[PDB]
Structures are given as structure tokens and as C-alpha cells.
XYZ file of C-alpha atoms in Angstrom:
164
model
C -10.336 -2.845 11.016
C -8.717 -2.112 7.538
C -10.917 -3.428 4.871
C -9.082 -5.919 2.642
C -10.378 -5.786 -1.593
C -9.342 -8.671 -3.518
C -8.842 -8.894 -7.055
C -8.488 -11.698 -9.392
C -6.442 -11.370 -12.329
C -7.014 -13.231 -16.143
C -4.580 -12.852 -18.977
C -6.483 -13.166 -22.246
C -9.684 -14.516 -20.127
C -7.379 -17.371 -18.721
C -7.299 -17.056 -14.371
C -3.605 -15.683 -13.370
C -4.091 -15.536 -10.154
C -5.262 -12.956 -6.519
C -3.921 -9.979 -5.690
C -5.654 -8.413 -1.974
C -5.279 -5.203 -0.852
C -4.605 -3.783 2.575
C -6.609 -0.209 2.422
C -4.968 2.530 4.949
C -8.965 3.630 5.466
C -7.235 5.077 9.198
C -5.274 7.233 7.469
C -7.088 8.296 3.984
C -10.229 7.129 4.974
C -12.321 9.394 1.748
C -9.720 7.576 -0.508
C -9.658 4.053 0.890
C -13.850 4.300 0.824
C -13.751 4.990 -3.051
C -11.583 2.153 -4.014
C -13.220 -0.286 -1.677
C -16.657 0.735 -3.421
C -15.397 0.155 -6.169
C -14.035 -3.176 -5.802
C -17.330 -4.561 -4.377
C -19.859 -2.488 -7.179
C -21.889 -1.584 -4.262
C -22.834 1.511 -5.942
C -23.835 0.227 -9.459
C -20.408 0.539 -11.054
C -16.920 -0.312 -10.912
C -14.300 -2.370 -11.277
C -14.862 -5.866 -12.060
C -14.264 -6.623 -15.575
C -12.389 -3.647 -16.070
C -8.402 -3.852 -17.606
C -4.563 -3.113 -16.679
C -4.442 -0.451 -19.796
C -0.494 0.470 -18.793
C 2.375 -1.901 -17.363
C 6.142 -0.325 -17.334
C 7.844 -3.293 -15.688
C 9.986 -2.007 -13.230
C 7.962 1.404 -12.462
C 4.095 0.323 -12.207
C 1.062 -1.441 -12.850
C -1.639 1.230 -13.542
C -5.563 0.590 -13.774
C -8.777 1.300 -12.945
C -10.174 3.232 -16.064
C -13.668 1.169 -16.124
C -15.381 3.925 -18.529
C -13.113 3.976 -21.512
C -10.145 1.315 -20.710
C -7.484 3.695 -21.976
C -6.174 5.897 -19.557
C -8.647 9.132 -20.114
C -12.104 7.804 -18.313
C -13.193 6.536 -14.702
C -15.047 8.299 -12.119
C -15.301 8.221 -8.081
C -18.307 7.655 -5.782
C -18.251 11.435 -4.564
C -18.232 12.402 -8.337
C -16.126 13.196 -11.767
C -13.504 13.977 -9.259
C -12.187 14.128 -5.732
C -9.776 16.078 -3.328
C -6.500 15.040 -2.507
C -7.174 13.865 0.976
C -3.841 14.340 2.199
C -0.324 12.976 1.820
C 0.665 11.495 4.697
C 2.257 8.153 3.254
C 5.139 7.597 1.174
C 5.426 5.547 -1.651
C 8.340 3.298 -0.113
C 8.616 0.400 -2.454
C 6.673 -2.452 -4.237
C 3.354 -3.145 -3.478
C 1.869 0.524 -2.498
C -1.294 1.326 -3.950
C -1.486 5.277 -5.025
C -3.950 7.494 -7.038
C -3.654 8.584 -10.381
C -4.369 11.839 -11.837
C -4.105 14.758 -13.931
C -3.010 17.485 -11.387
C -4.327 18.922 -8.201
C -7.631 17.831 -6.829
C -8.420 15.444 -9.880
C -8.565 11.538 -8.170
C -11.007 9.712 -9.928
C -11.080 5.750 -10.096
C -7.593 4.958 -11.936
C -4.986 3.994 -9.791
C -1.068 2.139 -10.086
C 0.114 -0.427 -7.910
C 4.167 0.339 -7.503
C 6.510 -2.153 -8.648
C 9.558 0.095 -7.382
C 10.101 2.748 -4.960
C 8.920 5.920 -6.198
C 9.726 8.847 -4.249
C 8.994 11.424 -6.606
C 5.219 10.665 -6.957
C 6.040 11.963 -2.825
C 3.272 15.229 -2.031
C 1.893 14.139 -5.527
C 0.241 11.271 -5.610
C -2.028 10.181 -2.462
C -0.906 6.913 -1.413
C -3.952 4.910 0.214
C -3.134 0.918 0.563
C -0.800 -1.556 -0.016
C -0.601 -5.479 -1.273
C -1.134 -7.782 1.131
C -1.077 -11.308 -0.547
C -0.233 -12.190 -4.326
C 2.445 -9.912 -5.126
C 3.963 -12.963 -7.127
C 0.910 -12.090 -8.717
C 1.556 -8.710 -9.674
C 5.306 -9.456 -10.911
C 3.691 -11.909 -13.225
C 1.312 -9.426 -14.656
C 4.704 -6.958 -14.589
C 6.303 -9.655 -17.625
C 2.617 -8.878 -19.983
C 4.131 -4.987 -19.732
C 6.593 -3.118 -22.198
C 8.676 0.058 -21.839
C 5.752 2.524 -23.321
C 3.117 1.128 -20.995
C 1.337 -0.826 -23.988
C 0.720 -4.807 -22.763
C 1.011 -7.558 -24.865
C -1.980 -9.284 -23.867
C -5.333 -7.951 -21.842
C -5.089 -8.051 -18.484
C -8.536 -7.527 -16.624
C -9.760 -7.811 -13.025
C -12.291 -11.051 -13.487
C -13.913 -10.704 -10.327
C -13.162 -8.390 -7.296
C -14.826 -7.523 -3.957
C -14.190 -7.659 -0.070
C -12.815 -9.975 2.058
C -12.117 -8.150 5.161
């Protein structure tokens, strides 16, 4: 009953490869709703053509900045900004799919998929889904990334949507 969100992955416009996403929509359902939107462009924007604008192999993958591909824009479906829904899961290793943001209350579109375990982003971060195939995938976009985030060549979401 969890939607699945798939996205495909170029390097420099040339395919890498699918990542899909497992959305918790059970337990964060507000959360899992805006990134699922997002995915398909249901609402008139989103995420499809949008880049990876900070990789620190070893820590994250962070994305989802479709208004000014740097880290300062985005936006939700409910608005500028939305609630932290609650914190329920942890961020337990690879693969988890958490929110970004700039303090309390603040979720917008950008996101990080974890590479490691990150236990301090715990009560802070609202964890909402989790890779389900192609995390092969996401270590290979992991080797584009560089200690201060900056990556070495463009990495952008080609095409995305549901599956499930």
C-alpha cells in the first residue's frame, strides 16, 4: 500500500541508472504525499529534471532544490513550507530518505538520501522512506561527490514518477 517513486539518474545527460523509493506514507503520511507529488509533477511542478547539488561520499546524497539548483530554493505542495510531521523513524543506515531544512517547521522539497548511519539528524530531521532497488545506483552517484559537497559532474533526475 506504500507508494513506490522511481528516479532515473544521468551523469552529464548520459543514463546512470534507477533508484525507487519505498515511501513510509503509514507512518508520515503529509511527508510521504509531498515527495510522491513531486516525483510524478502531478501538481505542475517538481522534480524531474532537477539536480544532486551536494554529494559528501560517505555522509549523503542531498537533492531536490528544483527552483534554484543550489541548496537555497524548492517548495512543497502545502506551500513555502511544511510542519515536521513527526519523528517516529530513525535514520539507521544507508538508503533512508529524510527531509532537509533550515530549522523547526521549515520542510520544503530538498531532501538527502543517507549513505551512512546518521543518528544525530535523530528528532531533527523527519525521516519518511527508504531505497528499495538501485542502491548500487546511489554508491555510483556517491564517487561524482567530494568532501565540501561540490560534484564533479551534474547529476540530475532524467525522468521520475510512480510505480507502485
Amino acid at each position: 500500500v506504500n507508494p513506490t517513486v522511481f528516479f532515473d539518474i544521468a551523469v552529464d545527460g548520459e543514463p546512470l541508472g534507477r533508484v525507487s523509493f519505498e515511501l513510509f506514507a503509514d507512518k508520515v503520511p503529509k511527508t510521504a504525499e509531498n515527495f510522491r507529488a513531486l516525483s510524478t509533477g502531478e501538481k505542475g511542478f517538481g522534480y524531474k529534471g532537477s539536480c544532486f547539488h551536494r554529494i559528501i561520499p560517505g555522509f549523503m546524497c542531498q537533492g531536490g532544490d528544483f527552483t534554484r539548483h543550489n541548496g537555497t530554493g524548492g517548495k512543497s505542495i502545502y506551500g513555502e513550507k511544511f510542519e515536521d510531521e513527526n519523528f517516529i523513524l530513525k535514520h539507521t543506515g544507508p538508503g533512508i530518505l529524510s527531509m532537509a531544512n533550515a530549522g523547526p517547521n521549515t520542510n520544503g522539497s530538498q531532501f538527502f538520501i543517507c549513505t551512512a548511519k546518521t543518528e544525530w539528524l535523530d528528532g531533527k530531521h523527519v525521516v519518511f522512506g527508504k531505497v528499495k532497488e538501485g542502491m548500487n545506483i546511489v554508491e555510483a552517484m556517491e564517487r561524482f561527490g567530494s568532501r565540501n559537497g561540490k560534484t564533479s559532474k551534474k547529476i540530475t533526475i532524467a525522468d521520475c514518477g510512480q510505480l507502485e
